[PDB]
Amino acid sequence: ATGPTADPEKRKLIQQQLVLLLHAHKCQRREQANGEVRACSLPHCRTMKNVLNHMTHCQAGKACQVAHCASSRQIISHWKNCTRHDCPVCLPLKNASDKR
């Protein structure tokens, strides 16, 4: 009569958000080093890069009331400290980064 304690769609959203965040930060950073850059494979880059422009000036954790600021900062704080060799959500990105 009630829903489960966990669901795989939360793993699909965090993976779809993480893969798009890591793209958007590299997209934001490479622009200053290149004369021109091609159109991104992910359309949400336009909406997320505006959040990143706020986030370069924000580090207050849960105190910020901006929707995407806290969920992005929550991903980066994990990324900066996690033992990514065995974490189930970090693992597929850790492997996909190598194109060999």
């Binding site: 966990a6 939360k10 793993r11 699909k12 959203l13 965090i14 993976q15 779809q16 958000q17 993480l18 893969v19 798009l20 890591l22 793209h23 930060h25 590299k26 950073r29 490479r30 159109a39 494979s41 992910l42 359309p43 949400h44 909406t47 997320m48 990143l52 986030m55 370069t56 580090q59 207050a60 954790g61 849960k62 105190a63 929707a67 995407h68 806290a70 969920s71 900062r73 929550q74 991903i75 980066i76 704080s77 994990h78 990324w79 900066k80 400290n81 974490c87 189930p88 959500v89 970090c90 597929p92 990105l93 996909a96 980064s97």
Partner: protein
């Protein structure tokens, strides 16, 4: 988002979206977050708070979506 054939759900789209993109290997995002953070924001990725981001990413690339932005 400039052109599309049809706005419909599928399989293997998100795993392709992962395998064909670039990540924080040659350069990284550690500089924009600053030298200090708040551990009250820290949790497991499987425990993230993101229900408002769900609505932003529903506008395009995924395994199933309500619309596709221009």
């Amino acid at each position: 988002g400039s052109h599309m054939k049809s706005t419909q759900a599928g399989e293997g789209t998100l795993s392709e979206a992962l395998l064909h993109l670039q990540f924080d290997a040659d350069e990284d995002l550690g500089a924009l977050l600053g030298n200090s953070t708040d551990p009250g924001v820290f949790t497991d990725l499987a425990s993230v708070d993101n229900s408002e981001f769900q609505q932003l990413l529903n506008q395009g690339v995924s395994m199933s979506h309500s619309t596709a932005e221009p």
